[PDB]
Amino acid sequence: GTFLFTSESVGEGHPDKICDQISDAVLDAHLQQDPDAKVACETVAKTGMILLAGEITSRAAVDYQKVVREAVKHIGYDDSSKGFDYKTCNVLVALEQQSPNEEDIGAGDQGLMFGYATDETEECMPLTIVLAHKLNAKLAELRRNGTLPWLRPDSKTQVTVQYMQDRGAVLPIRVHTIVISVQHDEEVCLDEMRDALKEKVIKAVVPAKYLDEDTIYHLQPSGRFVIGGPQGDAGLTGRKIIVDTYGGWGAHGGGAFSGKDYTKVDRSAAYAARWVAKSLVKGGLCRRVLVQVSYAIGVSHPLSISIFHYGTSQKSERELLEIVKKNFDLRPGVIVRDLDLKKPIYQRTAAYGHFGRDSFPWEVPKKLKY
Amino acid sequence: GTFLFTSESVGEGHPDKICDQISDAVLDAHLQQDPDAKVACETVAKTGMILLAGEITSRAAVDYQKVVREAVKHIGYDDSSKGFDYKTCNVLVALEQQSPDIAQGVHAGDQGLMFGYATDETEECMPLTIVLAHKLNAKLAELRRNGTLPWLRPDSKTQVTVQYMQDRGAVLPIRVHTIVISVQHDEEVCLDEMRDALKEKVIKAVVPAKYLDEDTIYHLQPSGRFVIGGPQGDAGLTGRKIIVDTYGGWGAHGGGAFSGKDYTKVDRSAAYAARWVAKSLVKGGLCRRVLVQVSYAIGVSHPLSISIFHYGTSQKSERELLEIVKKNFDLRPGVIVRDLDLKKPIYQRTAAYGHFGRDSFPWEVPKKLKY
Amino acid sequence: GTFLFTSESVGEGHPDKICDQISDAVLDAHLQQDPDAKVACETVAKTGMILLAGEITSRAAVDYQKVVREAVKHIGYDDSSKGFDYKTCNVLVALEQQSPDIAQGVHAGDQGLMFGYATDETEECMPLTIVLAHKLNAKLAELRRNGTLPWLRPDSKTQVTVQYMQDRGAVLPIRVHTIVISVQHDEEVCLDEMRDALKEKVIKAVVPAKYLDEDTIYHLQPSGRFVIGGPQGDAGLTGRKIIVDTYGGWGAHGGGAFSGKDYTKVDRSAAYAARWVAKSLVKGGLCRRVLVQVSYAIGVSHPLSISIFHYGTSQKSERELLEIVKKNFDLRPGVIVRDLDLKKPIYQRTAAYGHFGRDSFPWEVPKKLKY
Amino acid sequence: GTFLFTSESVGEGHPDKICDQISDAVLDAHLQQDPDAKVACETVAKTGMILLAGEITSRAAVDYQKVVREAVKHIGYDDSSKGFDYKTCNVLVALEQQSPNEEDIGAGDQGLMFGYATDETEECMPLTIVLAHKLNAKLAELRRNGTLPWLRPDSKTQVTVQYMQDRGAVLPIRVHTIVISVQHDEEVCLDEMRDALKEKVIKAVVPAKYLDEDTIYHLQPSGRFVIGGPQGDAGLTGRKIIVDTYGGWGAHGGGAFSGKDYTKVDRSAAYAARWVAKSLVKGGLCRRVLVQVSYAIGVSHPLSISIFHYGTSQKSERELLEIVKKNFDLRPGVIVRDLDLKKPIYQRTAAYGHFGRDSFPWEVPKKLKY
């Protein structure tokens, strides 16, 4: 049977994503000096304020004012006309910082985590969330290179796709609806914005085979959007966890990723579960798969591993599990080495999705032996 | 045929849940005085600080000192020895409140989806993994408050792994495979005594005996020592336990936290409606297990689309169930608000022990279906 | 015989004065609704932040978003280019407000001293050094607001050194020795043009020509460049300009700031009373220059002691002046409050340009004395 | 003619003095690593919170959480029963920190400053403020060594003395009134507290010749005082400037001292003016004297220097000025060298008065040539 599915993505200037990106900029600053830094950094953004709160164990000396302001400048908030300015906003810091066989390190917390993959795209991700992210990334590219200099940092996209099912797999047929709202400078009209959104953004990102006569476009649906970001709005780290992962597809364990080092299995085991799911699909063992893992605080080994193939394998779920246990060691002290999780690359994961890119180690499938 | 599935839950004193409870206490304070209040309240808790941020349109005048402090008191943080004290903590108010529109005084949102889920494996009509996880935290609070284990403090986390088998799409719990409990405690009690009380007075008082066996794995105080807890040990924020609030990893989640958001946030009121629909189908005997997917389109009050996925557990087709749902439910967000009585101040009770599964809310009372 | 004496003053946009003005705006908001409000409001201003802290007992419901933002708007900080903007700054409210006593609803402090001072060297009855310093800041604000020098920003500081001679204890200003002016400015204007306008349109519009000569020293924009100012460049707090608020180093100060404190704080209302007494003696022709010292004892409403020090500028003994003061003034703090109308919301006007010397307040209106 | 004079002092646990002491602990932490650090650190204390705000130019890496908490522990707040606890209070940091002939350095700000001295005590200070400070210091000594273990950190004293005048000098005759309020543990009665205040504090500090039959004692005048410090109270740096100096005597320029390095003439020139006043009095050039100096931002030399002797010299005020100008160079870049103002000794100045101690360089008179 057929169904519609909708995923959302948000640009770097959305207040929740500002916080994710600042959190990871703080993490990256620690890791550049101290690869073994432990970081749990939560960020809050509201009118005129960034606040940092959390715990850090690190030998680094980090200038938080500079790291935060620079990230805000990088996002593109440099003037009160845009709603926020890195030069004059309030930065408050409440980070409590202590000084300090690695394969046996215990999980930093308990929790459950999922990975997912699907053969419907080359990236091995759901089409809805690939397209939603790609529309926001293209907005930011065109903003930053001056192709559309009226663009500002805050944006939200929603993409509805009509699917068919094929023996537990999902086959995207057409884009049903695209919604784009993007922040903009006072000096452009809506007719021009709408035309640019359709021609320079949607047509540059969405394969033409999914767009047809009945595709519904809602471009700047709420009209003008001059002020954005944290102004009259409050955001927090870890409030876009569905957007950061599979856009509604598969499942989620509840843990946020941004501002967390590798011992926080919320992030490292979700990355490893994605790596497992992608490896199974690119291995041709199934067409779509969900992987669950779980941990207890202070315990190095997973408490559970489970594999659900949606009926898209010739192997049983039990046989896939046995294969997974022969090819992967999901201790955090081992995941760190296989996925290089002490490298300061996290600020790049904080927008446009943690999954479906090529450059990240969890997106390179492992050759399986079975 | 068998598989494992794990869910977690956290106690009232976990720092993220403190924040959910405070944000909903704020919402209830506003609704008490102004049933049309619009609220989007975020809370941050860290060593000695409660910060309230967000936007409110309301006629209410709320005393945040009182609302925040009583909530913290009720949770049980009343001394520096416990890491946090309602008498001495810093309450910072950064909320932006405006009066409702002058001219309306004198006279349906995002393109998005919501999921509801229900399963006949428990009477709560919820996954056993998460029902048990919630009940373990609730039992710790009960024994802490009636003084049976006076060494307990408010911060707790639990995790339950169940071994299941499948039967024509339904899931049948066989036994509890693994239980984790970590709970904050006073300085005097010993690990042995804690691990013994958690097994004998908590777990065995909550988990049906038929699910426990000699191979069940217990990880009780697995870190070894948990004196530092609450916001002292970890920063809390509103809306960071969204899976604990819902189905424990089962079903699906389309995104959005609930607490500190009024009934006009559709990702809060339509999620409750989709639960209501899923629970009504299962209690109506129409299927054993169901995922209800409700899509809304920018503007249109009527849902864009509804899909019902019964996993094979129904004698009727997915198109027949969809027809039943349409004949019995009106899922326009304004109709939902009236049918589920969502203008009333009951939200603080939702903010610990899960939004779904308790027999305390209108969305947990099934609708008798005609067909 | 001659000597130098220096005093300073600061503009409305100096970060410490922003805080004094906000704290008094808070007090006035409360008094407007509840004339018995008790207020002790502290303000901190730093890059992008206004923080309100302190204690209030009041029946008022005040909108701090509005009160703080309008005050900042009025000061002139309305864009990030100026370093601070009322539209986008973070207002954090940490004030602790309680209702007045339940049971009194249905039905004189520290051992300390206060000083008043007055001198006949100006009509304001204040030292010339500080009268001139205040007027230079006021003139900058006037020319900034009417657009004569649109390159001016709100943050300014001035300092005036006067050469004096003495005559039987009175002080006689001879000339202005040195003037300092530092004022925040836009990016485009050049130092030469600023230094020329400050001399020609500010100083020469304010200082009587008889005090200026070819040897007068001008330090105008002495740091060279002052684009970064307001709370961006320096943290402000309430009650850090207490000498600018009073006599500019002349007379004496027994300790205490004024702004954000209601009339029941005796170090605020008895300082105004002692000014009133000192000014009344000088305008009554009883002396040319006077320091009035009023001591209060823990509990006793009546002053413990009053000493009058006339520096030799009076035909009457210091004991005769004391007798006159006692026959004409009742310095019990409750009587002071009634006589000077201190329950009214006029405090925000006190918080820039000095509490003493302007003909705008009851304590600056002399009492006609009988003797 | 005779008159009464009253001075106040407050203990380390008074909320305003907590902030002064934290500000100077932050300054001292910078100076221990970077002698040329520029610091303007303001502290705010209220229920459950210390906030730091200001500007720093320094090469130091300072852990602010540790510096603040430790200072709070040092003051003696370790439990919510006392109203405040270093282990669980909120510490928020908003310090903006940049990296960077010294005799020519310009004043860090404009301002006026006074120094004062008087021959009425050996310390060359007014008796009222010497006694007020000494009562608070003795309370803290007895608290910290366990002589009176019921004592807590917050305290306030007021001392009224009856004076005579002698040719512009002031002669203290008797103590008229002593007020002491001190914070205390629940477990002591007021009768015992009052007796200890009189016998172990007042009699150990006030010379017996000033105490007589009519001396009024107000000991714990407002009754019980269990909770103190910042709880239901707000304090700020630089709100006790009269207490920190001459207790009402002489004059004040308005600048606070705590949290400021030597380029902030509010502090360095006030120290130097005190040094000048003390040198004149110990030199026998007068019995009592007030010194004024003033500065402009970015200008190294004083704009004005003035000397008022109260009629207590045989020399004219003009002759004293000429002597001062021959023996002292009041440029901040020179004052720093003469008074050793890069040394991290400032936390010790933050309670019990900056003046009248023996160990500080501004309290050692210079031998004058004239």
From Swiss-Prot, chains A, D:
<dbReference type="Pfam" id="PF02772">
    <property type="entry name" value="S-AdoMet_synt_M"/>
</dbReference>
<dbReference type="GO" id="GO:0036094">
    <property type="term" value="F:small molecule binding"/>
</dbReference>
<dbReference type="Pfam" id="PF00438">
    <property type="entry name" value="S-AdoMet_synt_N"/>
</dbReference>
<keyword id="KW-0808">Transferase</keyword>
<feature type="cross-link" description="Glycyl lysine isopeptide (Lys-Gly) (interchain with G-Cter in SUMO2)">
    <location>
        <position position="203"/>
    </location>
</feature>
<dbReference type="GO" id="GO:0046872">
    <property type="term" value="F:metal ion binding"/>
</dbReference>
<dbReference type="InterPro" id="IPR022636">
    <property type="entry name" value="S-AdoMet_synthetase_sfam"/>
</dbReference>
<comment type="function">
    <text>Catalyzes the formation of S-adenosylmethionine from methionine and ATP. The reaction comprises two steps that are both catalyzed by the same enzyme: formation of S-adenosylmethionine (AdoMet) and triphosphate, and subsequent hydrolysis of the triphosphate.</text>
</comment>
<feature type="binding site" description="in other chain">
    <location>
        <begin position="154"/>
        <end position="156"/>
    </location>
    <ligand>
        <name>ATP</name>
    </ligand>
</feature>
<dbReference type="Pfam" id="PF02773">
    <property type="entry name" value="S-AdoMet_synt_C"/>
</dbReference>
<feature type="modified residue" description="Phosphoserine">
    <location>
        <position position="359"/>
    </location>
</feature>
<dbReference type="GO" id="GO:0004478">
    <property type="term" value="F:methionine adenosyltransferase activity"/>
</dbReference>
<keyword id="KW-0460">Magnesium</keyword>
<feature type="binding site">
    <location>
        <position position="256"/>
    </location>
    <ligand>
        <name>ATP</name>
    </ligand>
</feature>
<keyword id="KW-0547">Nucleotide-binding</keyword>
<feature type="binding site" description="in other chain">
    <location>
        <position position="14"/>
    </location>
    <ligand>
        <name>ATP</name>
    </ligand>
</feature>
<feature type="binding site" description="in other chain">
    <location>
        <position position="264"/>
    </location>
    <ligand>
        <name>L-methionine</name>
    </ligand>
</feature>
<dbReference type="GO" id="GO:0005524">
    <property type="term" value="F:ATP binding"/>
</dbReference>
<feature type="binding site">
    <location>
        <position position="233"/>
    </location>
    <ligand>
        <name>L-methionine</name>
    </ligand>
</feature>
<feature type="cross-link" description="Glycyl lysine isopeptide (Lys-Gly) (interchain with G-Cter in SUMO2)">
    <location>
        <position position="209"/>
    </location>
</feature>
<dbReference type="InterPro" id="IPR022629">
    <property type="entry name" value="S-AdoMet_synt_central"/>
</dbReference>
<comment type="subunit">
    <text>Heterotrimer; composed of a catalytic MAT2A homodimer that binds one regulatory MAT2B chain. Heterohexamer; composed of a central, catalytic MAT2A homotetramer flanked on either side by a regulatory MAT2B chain.</text>
</comment>
<keyword id="KW-0479">Metal-binding</keyword>
<comment type="pathway">
    <text>Amino-acid biosynthesis; S-adenosyl-L-methionine biosynthesis; S-adenosyl-L-methionine from L-methionine: step 1/1.</text>
</comment>
<dbReference type="InterPro" id="IPR002133">
    <property type="entry name" value="S-AdoMet_synthetase"/>
</dbReference>
<feature type="binding site" description="in other chain">
    <location>
        <begin position="239"/>
        <end position="240"/>
    </location>
    <ligand>
        <name>ATP</name>
    </ligand>
</feature>
<dbReference type="GO" id="GO:0048269">
    <property type="term" value="C:methionine adenosyltransferase complex"/>
</dbReference>
<keyword id="KW-0597">Phosphoprotein</keyword>
<feature type="binding site">
    <location>
        <position position="260"/>
    </location>
    <ligand>
        <name>ATP</name>
    </ligand>
</feature>
<feature type="modified residue" description="Phosphoserine">
    <location>
        <position position="99"/>
    </location>
</feature>
<feature type="binding site" description="in other chain">
    <location>
        <begin position="222"/>
        <end position="225"/>
    </location>
    <ligand>
        <name>ATP</name>
    </ligand>
</feature>
<dbReference type="GO" id="GO:0005829">
    <property type="term" value="C:cytosol"/>
</dbReference>
<dbReference type="GO" id="GO:0006730">
    <property type="term" value="P:one-carbon metabolic process"/>
</dbReference>
<feature type="modified residue" description="N6-acetyllysine">
    <location>
        <position position="66"/>
    </location>
</feature>
<keyword id="KW-0630">Potassium</keyword>
<keyword id="KW-0554">One-carbon metabolism</keyword>
<dbReference type="GO" id="GO:0051291">
    <property type="term" value="P:protein heterooligomerization"/>
</dbReference>
<feature type="binding site">
    <location>
        <position position="16"/>
    </location>
    <ligand>
        <name>Mg(2+)</name>
    </ligand>
</feature>
<protein>
    <recommendedName>
        <fullName>S-adenosylmethionine synthase isoform type-2</fullName>
        <ecNumber>2.5.1.6</ecNumber>
    </recommendedName>
</protein>
<comment type="similarity">
    <text>Belongs to the AdoMet synthase family.</text>
</comment>
<feature type="binding site" description="in other chain">
    <location>
        <position position="98"/>
    </location>
    <ligand>
        <name>L-methionine</name>
    </ligand>
</feature>
<feature type="binding site" description="in other chain">
    <location>
        <position position="55"/>
    </location>
    <ligand>
        <name>L-methionine</name>
    </ligand>
</feature>
